[PDB]
Amino acid sequence: LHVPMVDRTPEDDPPPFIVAVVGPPGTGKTTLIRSLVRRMTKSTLNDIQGPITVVSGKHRRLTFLECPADDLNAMIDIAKIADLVLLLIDGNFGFEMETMEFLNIAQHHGMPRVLGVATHLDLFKSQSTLRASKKRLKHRFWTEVYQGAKLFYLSGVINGRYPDREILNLSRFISVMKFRPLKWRNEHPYMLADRFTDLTHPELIETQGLQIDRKVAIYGYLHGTPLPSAPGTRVHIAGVGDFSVAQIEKLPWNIGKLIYMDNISPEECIRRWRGVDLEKFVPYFDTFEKLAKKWKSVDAIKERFLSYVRIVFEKVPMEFVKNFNPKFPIVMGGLLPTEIKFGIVKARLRRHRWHKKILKTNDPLVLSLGWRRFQTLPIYTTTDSRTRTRMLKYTPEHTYCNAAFYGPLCSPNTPFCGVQIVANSDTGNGFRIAATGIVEEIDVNIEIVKKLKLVGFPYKIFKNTAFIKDMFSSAMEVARFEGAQIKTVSGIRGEIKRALSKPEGHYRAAFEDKILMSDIVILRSWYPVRVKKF
Amino acid sequence: KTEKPKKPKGRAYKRLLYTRRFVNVTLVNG
Amino acid sequence: KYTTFQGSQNFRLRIVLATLSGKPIKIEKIRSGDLNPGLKDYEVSFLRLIESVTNGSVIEISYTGTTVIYRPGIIVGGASTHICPSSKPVGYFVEPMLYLAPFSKKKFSILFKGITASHNDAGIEAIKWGLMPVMEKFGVRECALHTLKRGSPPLGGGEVHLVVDSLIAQPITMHEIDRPIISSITGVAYSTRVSPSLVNRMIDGAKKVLKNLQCEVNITADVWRGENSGKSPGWGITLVAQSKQKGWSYFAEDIGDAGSIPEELGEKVACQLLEEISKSAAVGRNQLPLAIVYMVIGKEDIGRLRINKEQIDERFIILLRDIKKIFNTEVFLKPVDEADNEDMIATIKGIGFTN
Amino acid sequence: FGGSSHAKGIVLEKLGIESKQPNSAIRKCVRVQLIKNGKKVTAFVPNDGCLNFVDENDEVLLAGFGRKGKAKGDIPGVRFKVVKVSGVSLLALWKEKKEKPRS
RNA sequence: UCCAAGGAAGGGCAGGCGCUUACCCAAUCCUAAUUCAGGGAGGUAGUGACAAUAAAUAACGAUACAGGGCCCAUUCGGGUCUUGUAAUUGGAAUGAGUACAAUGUAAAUACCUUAACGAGGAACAAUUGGAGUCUGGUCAGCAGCCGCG
Secondary structure (H helix, E strand, O other): OOOOHHHHOOOOOOOOOEEEEEOOOOOOHHHHHHHHHHHHOOOOOOOOOOOOEEOOOOOOOEEEEEOOOOOOHHHHHOOOOOOEEEEEEOOOOOOOOOOOOHHHHHHHOOOOEOOEEEOOOOOOOOOOHHHHHHHHHHHHOOOOOOOOOOEEEOOOOOOOOOOOOHHHHHHHHHHHOOOOOOOOOOOOEEEEEEEEEEEOOOOOOOOOOOOOOOEEEEEEEEEEOOOOOOOOOEEEEOOOEEEEOOEEEEEOOOHHHHOOOOOOOHHHHHHHHOOOOOOOOOOOOOOHHHHHHHOOOOHHHHHHEOOEEEEEEOOOOHHHOOOOOOOOOOEEEOOOOOOOOEEEEEEEEEEOOOOOOOEEOOOOEEEEEOOEEEEEOOEEEEEOOOOEEEEOOEEOOOOOOEEEEEEEOOOOOOEEEEEEEOOOOOOOOOEEEEEEEEEEEEOOOOOOOOOOOOOEOOOOOOOOOEOOOOOOOOHHHHHHHHHOOEOOOOOOOEOOOEOOOOOOOOOEEOEOOOOOOOOOEOOOOOOOOOOOOO | OOOOOOOOOOHHHHHHHHHHHHHHHHHHHO | OOEEEEOOOOHHHHHHHHHHHOOOEEEEOOOOOOOOOOOOHHHHHHHHHHHHHEEOOEEEEOOOOOOEEEEOOEEOOOEEEEEOOOOOOOHHHHHHHOOOOOOOOOOEEEEEEEOOOOOOOOOHHHHHHHOHHHHHHOOOOOEEEEEEEOOEOOOEOEEEEEEEOOOOOOOOOOEEOOOOOEOEEEEEEEEEOOOOOHHHHHHHHHHOOOOOOOOOEEEEEEEEOOHHHOOOOEEEEEEEEEEOOOOEEEEEEEEEOOOOOHHHHHHHHHHHHHHHHHOOOOOOOOOHHHHHHHHHOOOOOEEEEEEOOOOOOHHHHHHHHHHHHHOOOOEEEEEOOOOOOOOEEEEEEOOOOOO | OOOOOEEEEEEEEEOOOOOOOOOOOOOOOEEEEEOOOOOEEEEEOOOOOOOOOOOOOOEEEEEEOOOOOOOOOOOOOOOEEEEEEOOOOHHHHHHOOOOOOOO
């Protein structure tokens, strides 16, 4: 309620509005971008320099973003910072099991206002049967995924595309309908980059090499809670790593000054301002003659009763210069205290809809936590009695685990999205969604328990005079556990008496009934194995 | 969602029921 | 490790604010020129207490003791029991742990053994009456100090059970811009191993001074006799001025030693109390770091505390300098529109989750 | 209720209600403050668990039980049941037919 | 409202949300510099569970194995035996939909027709329910012996 309140007030025309065009690579996304900006600037500009600052008057300026459908990272990176989803669809999607999983990412990380745009349904359809298919898509999406969004249908008029009233309906929905607040986004300072300049402190043998990072001046506008408040704060560069900032630039008789002037002694602050340690809690007073004679009369207390940024970096290293490219959009985050730390985190999970596998504990998983993408081994555990007595081997449809792993710690219990990684040529989406959940709590130094099983198969048993035919081969083992308490999966406990110098399985023990002849007589509580760190 | 019902739809369900009813009826009256 | 400090000045405060900040610190050159260099006993033992109430923290101590490295961990705590040494009383240890009290995942239930009185640190009823309703003003619902036994100097023998129940994530923002009207004056006069009359003589020492005012003065006689009175005899007295509309307070305490006079003790605590009334706007100098620290670590908003010109001493200036060194949060004072007093208003941007 | 059929509210905390069948498996209850009235009303969630889905501190839609008051059985005096968190209708999240929003 | 700072100019209007609007004068009539053409006259497409309308998801044959099959009294027990499991297996019959043509003809869109295709269950993918003394899994809490949820 106050997290939406901090966002809207400084936001005005030079802070843009975030709009992404997301869709398949084959369709004319770029054509829709050109005809969309054809309405804004006068009638003829059909050249793409994206991302670029779109000056849409003094009322609302915007900035537009597209990303290719094969990039696994920035498809995630665009999803959490958006304020409008504009999806372009074909006449060939809807049960395509490998091309439309990003819908779940926008479902989980925060859904803004969404849009369906139908364009290739004219070159493919020629008859009255397109009307039932469009309404069929209205049965699927987006009317079922959110009640309160409009599915648009546009003509296929690829390059040569209209300026007329249909993008006045599109710019009607863009121009009028605004954004719903995203909770955990607006508690962080976060900024999209607009311009990007490389300052190298000109040519020297300490300017280029194998290890040289230079002063990058980056340029953009602010979003969320204010980042310029102090120099030398922290930041995250997506895909590259977490860094600090060196120097940030911003382009949109008094005791209160003398206290912060640290070349002045505090007795000179008191001395200039008019006219010893907190290890003594009780404050200073004068002598009893002075306070007594001074406070003989008590009259003196008788009323006392009834925008734009120019950000400087000393980063990043030389190998990212060789990964320079046209600006496939890059976003800056801001890390908080109790999240710069590392720790073991406990998080609730479940299995994901339109996913077709199972998850062992040894296959590492790619996790998106806030602004950070990290590969971590997801060791699962369950309780069965409001206390843990086992772990599991792979998270089923049967039960839904309590997952634990080690990485960056995240106190405010954020929602938690887990992608199984594929290559750039496996499905058609850069990831495929493995599981989703929520950070439940933070807990360092916890220890999982897996109860193994020493095996003894019964054959002929009575209560007091009890042997096991086949359970052991060493006598000194039983000599050590003679002070212990044994079991059976049926639930009538035993207590071993004495090894009796027979290391053949046969030895005398105790049960508080006679264990039955279709039972399994065992022993419990085995070694509490460690956590894989990565 | 369950894959449990396989049972027919519409008219074919009413035919089978009628046959079963007749069989049940033959016993008790006879 | 990199945030560097000097000497034993503000040792507990920099450990506590280092813990809440999550920033590692390094306090060096503690008592390098003194006869017994390095840390004292109570400083080492207090660092053991911080090692107890936390997890993941690492404290490194130099072999000469002059250099201390502090990396904090998460705040856990729980139920335990600490022994206090004879060099400092229990209130020296109850004093910093109130800051970390709501910010744990488990309730602070730690029993304390040690001396229960001194002339420099905090007493029992000072913490119970002067700190705990004031942290209840900042949004703590349930907090309690349970004295099992008292201990007079030099031997002590006191047990106080510290339990904090309510767990918040940040303090609520406070706006105290006006000087309150004090309702009544109460207080506690306790004693161990001695007469039931010298308590009444201390309360005579209060009634000689606080008789001229127009508020009621109602002071409780508290005599402990038996094993509850510890090993050593003694007597102490504590006064609290309370305002029942918003529930504000002020306090002053002192104990009497061997050969001292109970009536002059009562007049001394009374005159220091009225002196603390005159030096104040909203809280006392004894209540000042609690309010300043609680307004710093609140949620991200502007808060205001009316302070007086007498309350700004060197302790307050070094306090805000240490806040700038730890959290880098800055407070700004505006002169009030009144001309009767000379107060000014503290403006605080709360930290929230700012890095 | 105030006479109407439903009331929309906010989770404060998660309690513990257990069972005897099939064995001791936890059936739970949740604590919801009313938005419109401020009275604090408990509720029950009829399913296999589903405490996992909802959260602390989120938006629910309470609903009546249908007996003119009159709690069902050995759950003690609980009169109301939960239908919709975040507008997406728990039963649809129960099968798999929806995925829950961000909050 | 604009300003080159001289001066020049429109009448505060509709429309929409809050409860995406196109084509044509072929007919009727009117006008015509009028047997030419025009008409913000006129005519033709977009919009759909509060409702509601018809009926498709299969029809007919064949054989070898096999019977403690069904009903009434929850009972104690009694009356009536015409039964199903196997692709054993075979030919039929069709339109949901795919598509030229013509009619329609504001130029014209849809509608009335249509050769060409098109099934043995993965089919060409109905459901929301409801019970059920049913089957399974390591849980108060423990002995002199046997268990309970």
